[PDB]
């Protein structure tokens, strides 16, 4: 429960949440994402991953968080929806970044929490390409588009249809709680 470890864990978590939004939204824009690797330490690439930030998304993500971090009862959710040219909307995905009360006492925030979050981000990248909404998002732009919303609070799972699936992207244990990242997605594309 050390102080310098607390300020660093909060910064790690905050930036992990911000990058989680960016990864999810960029996976639903309709374009392939191809970023560059560099041997040289850029000094500003969070979790050592080449994630170019979209400013609008960063602003929208900060407004939902409002200077707060995930905690028990306060989860960050990215909602992904389909909107037709005629105005119909169908919910596709709910990504939830949660933190629970379960603590990991012997875990080093200095680099072990950092590197596990970096791994979780990488799992997020892979998973966003293989859920049913990815193909829909790549084909978007004419009869429909893909919209997104960022809630911060209680997780509500309505709107995905009976029989929706949930995939756990992964978990990171920390001295103040365990981060869990998952996706609940609709399979009845009606």
């Amino acid at each position: 429960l050390n102080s310098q470890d607390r300020k660093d864990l909060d910064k790690f978590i905050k930036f992990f949440a911000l990058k989680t939004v960016q990864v999810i939204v960029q996976a639903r824009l309709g374009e392939k994402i191809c970023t560059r690797s560099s041997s040289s330490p850029t000094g500003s690439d969070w979790f050592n991953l080449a994630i170019k930030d979209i400013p609008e998304v960063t602003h929208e993500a900060k407004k939902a968080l409002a200077g707060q971090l995930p905690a028990v009862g306060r989860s960050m959710c990215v909602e992904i929806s389909l909107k037709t040219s005629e105005g119909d909307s169908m919910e596709l995905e709910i990504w939830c970044l949660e933190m629970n009360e379960k603590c990991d006492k012997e875990i080093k925030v200095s680099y072990t929490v950092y590197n596990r979050l970096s791994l979780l981000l990488k799992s997020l990248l892979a998973i966003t390409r293989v859920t049913p909404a990815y193909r829909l998002s790549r084909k978007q732009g004419h009869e429909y588009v893909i919209l997104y919303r960022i809630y911060f609070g209680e997780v509500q799972l309505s709107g995905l249809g009976e029989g929706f699936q949930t995939v756990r992207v992964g978990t990171v244990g920390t001295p103040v709680g365990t981060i869990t990242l998952s996706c609940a997605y609709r399979i009845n594309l009606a």
Partner: peptide, 8 residues
Amino acid sequence: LPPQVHKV
């Protein structure tokens, strides 16, 4: 800004 260096 992220951690600039990692110590082992």
